[PDB]
Design a protein around this ligand. Structure first.
Ligand SMILES: NC(=O)NC1=NC(=O)NC1=O
Ligand SMILES: NC(=O)NC1=NC(=O)NC1=O
Lengths: 164, 165
C-alpha cells in the first residue's frame, strides 16, 4: 500500500527498503527525500535515477557490495536473507564439488578482469543460464560490462521491492 | 603503510574501510577505483569528492544511515563497533533514564525539522557539547544544516581512518 509507505518515518523506510540494493541502504535512504510516491513504480524510477547519477566509481562500488555467487559468504552462511533466498532459487546452494570449483574459477577470472564481482539477477536465471552469461560477459569490454552489470542490479532491486 | 593499502583486493579494502562512513561501504568500495592512493590524505580527498558529487538526496541519505546518539540502537546494543565505541566516549552509554529520555526528545525535534538524524563527531564532543550543538543547529536553515552535517560525517570518517592506522 503506497499510502502506508508514504507515511513511513525515514528510519522505518530505511529498515524496510534498506537492502533492495545489496548492502547499499544509502540508496533507499536517499530516495525517501522524494516522497510522496505515486506507486512502487515511482520508487523504482527514483532508484534507477539515483544509480545513474553516480560516477562510474559509484556504480562499480555498488557492484563491490555484492557477494559472489556460490562464494565465501554462501559457504559461510553470511549472505543477507535476500541473497540467500535468491542464490538457492538459482541452484547455488546445491552445486556439486565440480560445480563449486568451476564457479570459483569463473568468479576469480571475472573479478581479475573487471575489478568488481560478477552480478546477475539470480531469480531470473538458473544454474546453466548463469554459467552461460558469466562466460559471455567475461568477453565484454569494461564500459559495456559496467552497464550490463548495473542493469542486473536494477532487476534485482525491482524484484526485491516487489517482495516487500 | 599506504603500499599495503594500495595492494589490497577490493574485497579486503571494503572489509577494512567499509565502515569509515557509517553503513556506507559503497563509498569505500567506490574509491578503490582511484588507486593507487598517494597517502591517507588522498584517500580522504577521494571520499570527500565522492560525497560532494552526489545529489543533495545522497548526502541526506548518508546522514539517514547514521544511528541516533543514545537511541534505539545503542539501547538495543545493535550499533556498529565504531559507533558503539564513539558514543561510549561521548558518554552516551552511562546515561540515566532521565537523560536517555531527554536525548530522545532532542533527537525527535531535530529529525522532524530536517528529515535526517542529528549527526556530530562523537569522539570530539562530550555529553554537554552534544546537547549544546543540538540546540544551536536546530535553528539552522535546511540548506545550511545539510552542509554542516556532512562536514561532521567527514570528521567522523577521518578519525575512523586514523583509528585503522
Ligand atoms: N550475482 C551476484 O553477484 N549475486 C546474486 N544475484 C542475486 O540476485 N542475488 C545474489 O546473491
Ligand atoms: N552523531 C550520530 O548521529 N552518531 C554518532 N556520532 C559518531 O561519531 N558516532 C556515532 O555513533
Amino acid at each position: 500500500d503506497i499510502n502506508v509507505v508514504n507515511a513511513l518515518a525515514y528510519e522505518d523506510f530505511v529498515k524496510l527498503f534498506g537492502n533492495v540494493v545489496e548492502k547499499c541502504p544509502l540508496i533507499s535512504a536517499a530516495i525517501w527525500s522524494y516522497r510522496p510516491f505515486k506507486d512502487l513504480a515511482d520508487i523504482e524510477a527514483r532508484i534507477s535515477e539515483f544509480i545513474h547519477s553516480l560516477p562510474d566509481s559509484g556504480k562499480e562500488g555498488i557492484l563491490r557490495c555484492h557477494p559472489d555467487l556460490a562464494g565465501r559468504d554462501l559457504q559461510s552462511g553470511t549472505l543477507t536473507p535476500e541473497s540467500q533466498e535468491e542464490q538457492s532459487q538459482a541452484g547455488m546452494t546445491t552445486l556439486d564439488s565440480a560445480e563449486i570449483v568451476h564457479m570459483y574459477r569463473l568468479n576469480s577470472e571475472y573479478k581479475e578482469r573487471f575489478g568488481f564481482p560478477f552480478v546477475i539477477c539470480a531469480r531470473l536465471n538458473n544454474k546453466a543460464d548463469i554459467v552461460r552469461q558469466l562466460s559471455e560477459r567475461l568477453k565484454n569490454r569494461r564500459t559495456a560490462e559496467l552497464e550490463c552489470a548495473i542493469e542486473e542490479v536494477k532487476k534485482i532491486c525491482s524484484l526485491r521491492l516487489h517482495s516487500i
